[PDB]
Amino acid sequence: KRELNGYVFISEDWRLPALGSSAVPLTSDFLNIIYSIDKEELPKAVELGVDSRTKTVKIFASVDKLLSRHLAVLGSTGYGKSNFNALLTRKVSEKYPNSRIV
Amino acid sequence: SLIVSTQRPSELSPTVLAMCSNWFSLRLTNERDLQALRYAMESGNEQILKQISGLPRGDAVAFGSAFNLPVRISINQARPGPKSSDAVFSEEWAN
Amino acid sequence: SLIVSTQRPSELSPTVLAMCSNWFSLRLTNERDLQALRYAMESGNEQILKQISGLPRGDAVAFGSAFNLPVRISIN
Numbered sequence: 649k650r651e652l653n654g655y656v657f658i659s660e661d662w663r664l665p666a667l668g669s670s671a672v673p674l675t676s677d678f679l680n681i682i683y684s685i686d687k688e689e690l691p692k693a694v695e696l697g698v699d700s701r702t703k704t705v706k707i708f709a710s711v712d713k714l715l716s717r718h719l720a721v722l723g724s725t726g727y728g729k730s731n732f733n734a735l736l737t738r739k740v741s742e743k744y745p746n747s748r749i750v
Numbered sequence: 751s752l753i754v755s756t757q758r759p760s761e762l763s764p765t766v767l768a769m770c771s772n773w774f775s776l777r778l779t780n781e782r783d784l785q786a787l788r789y790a791m792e793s794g795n796e797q798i799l800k801q802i803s804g805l806p807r808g809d810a811v812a813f814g815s816a817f818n819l820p821v822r823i824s825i826n827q828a829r830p831g832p833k834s835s836d837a838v839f840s841e842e843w844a845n
Numbered sequence: 846s847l848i849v850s851t852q853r854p855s856e857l858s859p860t861v862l863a864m865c866s867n868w869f870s871l872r873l874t875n876e877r878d879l880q881a882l883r884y885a886m887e888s889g890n891e892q893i894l895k896q897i898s899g900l901p902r903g904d905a906v907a908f909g910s911a912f913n914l915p916v917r918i919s920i921n
């Protein structure tokens with residue numbers, strides 16, 4: 649829905665359309681809105697990667713929301729737990745190494 | 751390298767069976783062995799593990815980090831091959 | 846060689862059942878002996894085992910490592 653001059657995404661899943669309503673695909677303009685942050689943590693956002701299905705929309709995360717509680721990284725033996733651990737902790741823990749990894 | 755060879759995996763220690771990074775499995779006879787053999791896999795599935803009971807002599811199932819997908823391979827017969835050191839009753843009964 | 850003809854094999858450890866070469870099953874009704882026989886009985890054979898209740902006089906089934914597929918053997 650429109651808020652002031654752009655749009656916003658809500659996560660309520662009981663609203664359904666009426667019979668006879670047309671169907672349209674989703675453009676990248678409407679895909680950016682679904683995978684965005686709440687208009688106020690933009691200066692405090694970190695870039696991680698891009699979505700898989702369309703590889704056109706970037707992904708951002710909030711610093712305060714990520715490194716505030718328990719964080720977990722999973723995997724399988726003989727599958728890259730060492731490799732994935734190294735790569736992810738390399739790309740995530742560069743600018744602020746002050747966190748603790750015992 | 752450590753290589754474990756036996757004929758009763760279901761009665762083998764779980765950690766012994768889990769010290770492998772690649773696999774080359776031959777025929778296993780009994781059906782009851784599959785109860786604890788279901789854990790043996792680490793990078794496979796159930797669609798190819800169900801045809802080990804009917805695996806003939808010389809064939810094997812290979813899956814691991816060296817294969818893109820699990821395959822059933824027919825290994826060639828070695829030349830020369832192994833020999834036997836046990837006799838037969840007919841040879842003795844000849845007198 | 847060990848060919849023991851007995852009707853109470855449960856007193857033997859079940860680990861030895863794996864080295865046998867042929868399995869025989871006459872009219873069995875007692876729980877323990879039939880359960881022990883099924884404890885190490887080759888899979889894929891259920892219909893002939895459950896129909897034992899209707900066996901006529903002298904009818905029996907015998908197969909194993911020497912009989913590749915199940916057979917209903919009536920000794921001459």
Ligand SMILES: Nc1ncnc2c1ncn2[C@@H]1O[C@H](COP(=O)(O)OP(=O)(O)O)[C@@H](O)[C@H]1O
Pocket residue numbers: 724725726727728729730731732
């Ligand atoms: N820079 C890279 N470029 C492409 N592939 C990579 C790179 N670094 C690692 N990989 C891949 O990641 C996989 C990691 O698996 P591996 O670390 O061997 O699993 P495990 O550590 O559980 O044994 C490897 O197969 C490797 O091909």
Ligand SMILES: [Mg+2]
Pocket residue numbers: 724725726727728729730
């Ligand atoms: Mg690992």
